[PDB]
């Protein structure tokens, strides 16, 4: 019941954490809009850094994956973003697409939660509106 | 085009290709690689735009070396024909530079773009 | 009583300025290891105010 290993993400403060399908890598969302991939396949108590996805100015409030290839993230600027996490791909970390949610006129819009739907290959997103 | 780095992404390029358009309208755009080199030497550039699809790509690869020397942010866009069209010409433009002017009417978004490029770098 | 309270804050104070210097007290290694680090507030207090916005009318 004690902290086995304390690891610093080495980025802005964390909003969200998610684990991949193979359970070997952790994706970590930050205040500074940086998404850090942490490798954990080494062993229990072994946390290692894999890669940093590009840096954007909106927070990352939520994270989920599609298998081990893509990272979907909801952002505080009212936009959903897909990053490419494939190993051996020139488009690694590459922000392939951006979606924009309908934004409250008088209010800031936040994408609080995003989840991936394998059967329909769809993304479901919940927003502040 | 592995060496073109950092390369602006599909969302980002609009904000880049947007700002260049008004800069051309307001005569704050120096266009063509050789003009960009002038602006760095005189240090009158907010930042510089390059096209990754250029062939042979190296022609602009001197500009970055001059860029970090002067601590000037820079970014690559995928298409050169797109850039020249945004510059406001009938010929593809590979490299373009925005002229420094704190009194400009388009002043705010240029630096907003500059910050994003800085984060990208 | 207020003097006693101010005494606590002096004990709580872990850094003081000496001339041009400010010296900082060093915490124990166990305090870090036993528990996770303290939450930063500006990151968290923001979420709480959002959940308790006026337009929501939590009332």
């Amino acid at each position: 019941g004690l902290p086995l290993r304390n690891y610093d993400c080495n980025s802005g403060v964390i909003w969200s954490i998610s684990i991949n399908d193979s359970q070997d890598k952790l994706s970590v969302g930050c205040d500074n809009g940086t998404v850090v991939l942490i490798d954990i396949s080494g062993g229990p108590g072994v946390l290692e850094h894999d890669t940093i996805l590009m840096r954007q100015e909106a927070r990352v409030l939520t994270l989920a994956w599609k298998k081990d290839d893509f990272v979907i993230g909801g952002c505080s600027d009212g936009r959903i973003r897909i990053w490419s996490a494939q190993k051996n791909d020139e488009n690694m970390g590459r922000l392939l697409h951006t979606m924009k949610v309908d934004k409250a006129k008088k209010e800031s819009t936040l994408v609080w939660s995003v989840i991936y739907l394998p059967r329909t290959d769809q993304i479901a997103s919940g927003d502040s509106t | 085009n592995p060496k073109a780095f950092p390369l602006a992404d599909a969302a980002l390029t609009q904000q880049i290709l947007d700002v260049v358009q008004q800069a051309a309208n307001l005569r704050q755009l120096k266009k063509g690689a050789n003009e960009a080199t002038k602006t760095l030497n005189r240090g009158i550039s907010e930042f510089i735009i390059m096209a990754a699809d250029c062939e042979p790509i190296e022609i602009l690869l001197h500009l970055p070396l001059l860029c970090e020397d002067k601590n000037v942010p820079y970014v690559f866009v995928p298409s050169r024909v797109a850039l020249g069209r945004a510059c406001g010409v009938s010929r593809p433009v590979i490299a373009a530079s925005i002229t420094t002017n704190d009194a400009s009417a388009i002043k705010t978004q240029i630096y907003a773009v500059k910050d994003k490029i800085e984060t990208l770098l | 009583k207020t003097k006693k309270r101010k005494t606590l804050k002096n004990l709580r104070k872990d850094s003081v300025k000496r001339g041009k210097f400010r010296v900082q007290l060093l915490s124990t290694t166990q305090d870090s290891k036993t528990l996770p680090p303290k939450k930063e507030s500006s990151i968290i207090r923001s979420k709480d105010r959002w959940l308790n916005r006026k337009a929501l009318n939590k009332g």
């Binding site: 205040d31 100015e57 505080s76 800031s108 | 910050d115 | 923001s46």
Partner: peptide
């Protein structure tokens, strides 16, 4: 640079 921090700081803060 000093201003840009404010612009970045202002942009990140939620607007109510």
């Amino acid at each position: 640079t000093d201003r840009s921090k404010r612009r970045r700081f202002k942009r990140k803060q939620f607007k109510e």
